[PDB]
Paper text:
Furthermore, the GA algorithm can effectively generate a highly complete data set from hundreds of naturally multi-oriented samples collected at long wavelength, thus permitting the compilation of a highly complete data set with high multiplicity, and thus preserving a weak anomalous signal and enabling structure solution by standard SAD phasing procedures.
Data were collected to the maximum resolution possible of 1.929 Å owing to the geometry of the camera and the wavelength. The data collection (30 grid scans for 298 partial data sets) was completed within 2 h. The aggregated data set, obtained from the merging of 116 partial data-set wedges, resulted in high overall completeness and decent data quality, which allowed the location of the anomalous scatterers, successful phasing and structure refinement using standard methodology. A best weighted mean phase error (wMPE) of 34° and a CC for the partial model of 22% were obtained in SHELXE, with 119 amino acids automatically built. Finally, no evidence of radiation damage was present in the electron-density maps for the crystal structure of ConA.
Author numbering: 1 to 237
The structure:
């Protein structure tokens, strides 16, 4: 199976797999059962922003999610990602719906990784920023139902022509180039990610959520990962 580290924006509480009884943000280390969660006052139909940060000295994966005019939600988990992830990874966004549904629209996405080595004022770095997506976005690997270009957005899950989100959908977008998160001469490794999202649902119970994830470079959507598994995991272990 894939190796997955993710920050989940979980819109639907599945209490039998350890979700709290409310929408929440969580840190997932190789399991959909988050190592840490925090309550998330999700807003149907409003544009939100998520930030993810980590560095190899502090070994703490942290995330913050907010909306304009509202307080934020934050979650952190102490973990050495070099003991979890391989040396080369791909980064991406994932989303799903199940019997309950929502739009999982990405309006922008940025990522920065830095490897600071032993040699004088070195730094290896990768940075990308999307503030709009075109219909043929060649530097994204789209998987499942994900599409780009509709209103210049990245639609991670299926939406009808009338704009209604569809259930039982799963889709991901990974940045085309592999990302180097560890090197033998590196003295500090760090990354940060930001994405803005629009989760819209005609229903009182939207599902299932959006995640920023880091994976083995050849990661693909696991079989049966619609719904609560967020397109990231093959089971709820
Ligand atoms: Ca859930
Ligand atoms: Mn959850």
């Amino acid at each position: 199976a894939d190796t997955i580290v993710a920050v989940e924006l979980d819109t639907y509480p599945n209490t039998d797999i350890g979700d709290p009884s409310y929408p929440h943000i969580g840190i997932d280390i190789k399991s959909v059962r988050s190592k840490k969660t925090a309550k998330w006052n999700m807003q149907n139909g409003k544009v939100g922003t998520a930030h993810i940060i980590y560095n190899s000295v502090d070994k703490r994966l942290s995330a913050v999610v907010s909306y304009p005019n509202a307080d934020s939600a934050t979650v952190s988990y102490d973990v050495d990602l070099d003991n979890v992830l391989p040396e080369w990874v791909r980064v991406g966004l994932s989303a799903s719906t199940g019997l309950y549904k929502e739009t999982n629209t990405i309006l922008s996405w940025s990522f920065t990784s830095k490897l600071k080595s032993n040699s004088t004022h070195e730094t290896n770095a990768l940075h990308f920023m999307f503030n709009q997506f075109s219909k043929d976005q060649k530097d994204l690997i789209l998987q499942g139902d994900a599409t780009t270009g509709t209103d210049g957005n990245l639609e991670l899950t299926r939406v009808s022509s009338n704009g209604s989100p569809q259930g039982s959908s799963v889709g991901r977008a990974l940045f085309y180039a592999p990302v180097h998160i560890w090197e033998s001469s590196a003295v500090v490794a760090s990354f940060e990610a930001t994405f803005t999202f629009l989760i819209k649902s005609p229903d009182s119970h939207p599902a299932d959520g959006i995640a920023f994830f880091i994976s083995n470079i050849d990661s693909s959507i696991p079989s049966g990962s619609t719904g609560r598994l967020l397109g990231l995991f093959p089971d709820a272990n």
